[PDB]
Amino acid sequence: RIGYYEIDRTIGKGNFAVVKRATHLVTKAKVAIKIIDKTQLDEENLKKIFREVQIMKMLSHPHIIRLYQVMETERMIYLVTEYASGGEIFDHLVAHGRMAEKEARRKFKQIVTAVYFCHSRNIVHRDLKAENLLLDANLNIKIADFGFSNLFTPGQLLKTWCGSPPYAAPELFEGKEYDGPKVDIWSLGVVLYVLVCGALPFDGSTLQNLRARVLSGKFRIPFFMSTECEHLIRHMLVLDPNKRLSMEQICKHKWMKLGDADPNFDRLIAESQQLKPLNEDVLLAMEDMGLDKEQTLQSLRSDAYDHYSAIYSLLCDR
Ligand SMILES: COc1ccc(N(C(=O)Nc2c(C)cccc2C)c2cc(Nc3ccc(N4CCN(C)CC4)cc3)ncn2)c(OC)c1
C-alpha cells in the first residue's frame, strides 16, 4: 500500500523502474504505478524523467495514457496513470498475428488522433513504435512512453537524435536537424506497416545493415496488402521529409475513409484542429469524504498532481 493505493500486481520491470497494478482505495479505480529509484538515476536521466512527466501532464486525450498523480520521496518517484487492461500491442501480435485491415484501420485511426493532438499541443513523440502501444479493455489504443518526446515550435528544427532504429526516419540516422512532425509521420508509416504485415519494412542482422535499408527507402508490399493501404504507407515512408503526407492529409486518405463511418474520429481530429470547468458535485463529493474544498481548489489551481488532484480527476473520468 502506497498512500491511497493498494498494489496488487507487477506488470513491468525495466530501466530503473518497476510498474505495478494498484487500486485507488477511495475511488476504486485501477491504476498503473511506475516506481523509479532515484538512487539508480544519473543526472541527465533525472532531467529526462522530469521532462517526460511535464509532457504527460499536457496530454489529456482518449487515446493517450492519462497521468493522475505524482508522488515523490527522497529516494523514490511514483507515477500513477490510467490502466490499460488490454496490455501491449506486442502481446496481441504474438497471440494473433498480423491484423486484418479492418482491425488495423480502427487502431491506426486512434493512433493518428492521439499523435495529431500531440502536434496540436506542440508536442512531438519521436519514438512511436507498434509494440509499446497500450490497449484498453476493448482493445482501444492508448499511446504511452513519452520518454523521447519534446516541445517543438512549428518550423523550428530539432537536434536530438532519438528513438528506435526500425522506426527512425532516415534524416535521424544521417544526424541531420529535423522537422519534429515529419519524424513522427515516418514512424507512423512503419507502425502502420507492422500492424497490417506483422513484420518490419526495414530490418537487418546488424544496425549497419538496417541503416542502409532505411536510407534506401525500399520495402516489400506483401500480396495481402490492399492498394489503398500500400498507397498510404508509401506516402508516409518517403525519404524527403517535405514529400511526406501531413497529418491533415493522412486523416483524409481513402484508406481511412473506406469502411464503417466514424463520428468520434472526425470529432477528435476536429478538436485537435481548433485554435481557441469545475465540477461542483465532484468537489462536494470530495468534501463529504473529508477533503477540504479549499485545499482541493489549491491543488487544482497549482496543477499539483497530488492526492486531491488525483481524486478530482479520477471522479470526473467516471
Ligand atoms: C509491458 O511493459 C510495460 C509495463 C507497464 C507499462 N505501463 C506503464 O509503464 N505506464 C506508465 C506508467 C505507469 C507511468 C509512467 C509512464 C507510463 C508509460 C502501463 C501498462 C498498462 N497496461 C498493461 C498491462 C499489462 C501488460 N502486460 C501484461 C502481459 N504481459 C505478460 C506483461 C505486460 C502491459 C501493459 N497500463 C498502464 N501503464 C508499460 O507501458 C508501455 C509497459
CATH for the 87-273 domain, from 1.10.238.10, 1.10.510.10, 3.40.50.300, 1.10.3720.10:
1.10.510.10
Of 148, 143, 145, residue with least CA distance to 160: 148
Instruction: Give dist(CA 104, CA 91) in Å, integer.
Output: 15
Judge contact between 222 and 175, C-beta under 8 A.
no
Minimum CA distance residue for ligand 1 atom 16: 145
- Which residues have C-beta within 8 Å of that of residue 21, sequence separation ≥ 6? 7, 8, 9, 10, 11, 30, 31, 32, 33, 83
Phi and psi at residue 144, to the nearest 5°: -135, -155
Quick check: 124 and 162 in contact, CB under 8 A?
A: no
| CA 49 to centroid of ligand 1, rounded, Å | 16
127 is catalytic: yes
Residue whose CA is closest, atom 34 of ligand 1? 87
Q: Which residues belong to the annotated binding site?
A: 11-19, 34
Q: Cell numbers 486484418 label which residue? A: 100
Ligand 1 nearest atom to the CA of residue 135, by list position = 22
CA distance 36 to 13: 10
Q: Are 215 and 186 in contact (CB under 8 A)?
A: no
Which entry of 37, 42, 127, 281 is annotated as an active-site residue? 127
Q: How far is CA 10 from the centre of its chain?
A: 21
* d(C-alpha 64, C-alpha 123), whole Å: 13
Closest ligand 1 atom, CA of 82?
Answer: 37
For CATH 3.30.200.20, list the domain ranges present in the chain.
5-84+278-316
Which DSSP state fits 213?
Answer: H
Please tell me the number of Cα atoms within 13 Å of 171 on its side-chain side: 24
CA dihedral 158, 159, 160, 166 (to 10 degrees): 80
Which residues of the chain does CATH 1.10.510.10 include?
A: 87-273
- Alpha-carbon dihedral sign for residues 130, 123, 55, 172: positive
Distance between Cα 145 and ligand 1 center (Å): 9
Q: Could you tell me the CATH superfamily of domain 5-84+278-316?
A: Phosphorylase Kinase; domain 1 (3.30.200.20)
Nearest CA to ligand 1 atom 40: 144
- By residue count, the chain amounts to 318
Ligand 1 atom 35, closest CA = 87
Nine-digit cell string for 211? 541503416
The structure's method of determination equals: X-ray
Grid cell 503526407 is found at 245
Query: How far apart are the C-alpha atoms of 226 and 218, rounded to whole Å?
Result: 18
Decide: 57 and 116 in contact? Cβ < 8 Å: no
CA dist 89 and 253 (Å) reads 24
What are the phi and psi torsion angles at 4 (to 5°)?
-95, 15
Nearest to 190 by CA among 111, 248, 91: 111
- The C-alpha atoms of residue 312 and residue 291 are separated, in whole angstroms, by 10
| Nearest in space to 72 (alpha carbons), one of 48, 57, 53 | 53
Q: HSE (CB half, 13 Å, CA atoms) of 314?
A: 26
Cα(140) to centroid(ligand 1), Å? 15
Residue type for 117, please? F
Q: How many CA atoms lie within 13 A of 115 on its CB side?
A: 29
Which residue type is seen at 1? R
Task: Write out residues with Cβ below 6 Å of ligand 1.
Answer: 11-12, 19, 32-34, 65, 79, 81, 83-84, 87-88, 91, 132, 134, 144-145
Query: Cα(202) to centroid of ligand 1, in Å?
Result: 26
Backbone discontinuities in the chain, residue before each (C to N > 2.5 A): 276
Rounded to whole angstroms, what are the CA distances from 55 to 25, 40, 183, 279? 27, 23, 18, 24
Annotated resolution, angstroms: 1.9
Q: How many CB atoms lie within 10 A of CB 281?
A: 9
